[PDB]
């Protein structure tokens, strides 16, 4: 993991300054992605899906 900074604005961030929570984002985890795919696909009625297609 690593932090990426995109600078914006004309004001200068003083030392010991804090970026607000609204200007920061958290990653979408790979294990979260795998969990989503597997849990969603486990509930699929694949016979109905194939028949509908």
């Amino acid at each position: 993991k690593n932090i990426e900074i995109e600078p914006r604005g004309s004001e200068t961030l003083k030392p010991r300054g804090v970026l607000p929570v609204g200007q920061t984002s958290a990653p979408y985890q790979i294990y979260d992605a795998f969990l989503d795919v597997t849990r969603n696909a486990a509930g699929w009625d694949t016979q109905a899906v194939r028949q509908s297609l």
Partner: protein
């Protein structure tokens, strides 16, 4: 997130129910509405007047 099983299953079953063996019905709808709308549009000037 769009692959939620409930919505997928409901949409699939509903599509099966709606469109099973309805090809002839939809063909008849298309033919009849084509003929009716063409006949109506042939009187475009009359409708405007």
């Amino acid at each position: 997130r769009s692959l939620e099983p409930e919505k997928v299953n409901t949409i699939a079953t509903s599509l099966i129910t709606i469109f099973q063996g309805q090809g002839g019905t939809i063909n008849d709808i298309l033919d009849q509405t084509a003929q009716l709308t063409a006949s109506l549009a042939d009187r475009d000037q009359a409708i405007g007047e």
